[PDB]
Swiss-Prot record:
Superkingdom per UniProt: Eukaryota
Annotated consequence of substituting residue 51 to A: Induces a 3-fold decrease in PtdIns(3)P-binding
Signal peptide: none
Expression across tissues: Primarily expressed in brain. Also present in kidney, liver, intestine, placenta, leukocytes, heart and skeletal muscle (at protein level).
Record note on quaternary structure: Interacts with RAB14. Interacts with PTPN21.
Species assigned in the record: Homo sapiens
Protein name: Kinesin-like protein KIF16B
């Protein structure tokens, strides 16, 4: 309960945009303790998060971010595998950030408060934009 405070899943993906602005976005469902919310994020956004946070926190050097091949990303099977790898990435991301003692989210940091608020402050990837919902 308090030892597993952040849960995360990507139950589905959705095709957004029309023409060949058309791209997949992943439905990220996140629960921190009591609070649950959902954001839609394209692969680009996950990668930008990883890059940004990997230089701020060293414990994230051990994390391997899933690559994207140049061709073949219109195949739904590729996208489905991506959903899985991105969900595993997010789950490893939180494992590291909660268990690394050097981390601002270390479960045992004194006075650590954990909420949607502190998570959204920690990374704006998780901040709700226009299609996102609680």
């Amino acid at each position: 309960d308090l030892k597993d405070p952040i849960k995360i899943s990507i139950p589905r993906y959705v095709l957004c945009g029309q023409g060949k602005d058309a791209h997949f976005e992943f439905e990220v469902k996140i629960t921190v303790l009591d609070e649950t919310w959902t954001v839609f994020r394209r692969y680009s956004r996950f990668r930008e998060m990883h890059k940004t946070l990997k230089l701020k926190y060293a414990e994230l050097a051990a994390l391997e971010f899933p690559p994207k091949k140049l061709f073949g990303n219109k195949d739904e099977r590729v996208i489905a595998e991506r959903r899985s790898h991105l969900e595993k990435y997010l789950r490893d991301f939180f494992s590291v950030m909660l268990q690394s003692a050097t981390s601002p989210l270390h479960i045992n940091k004194v006075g650590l408060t954990l909420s949607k608020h502190t998570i959204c402050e920690f990374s704006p990837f998780f901040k709700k934009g226009v299609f996102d919902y609680s």
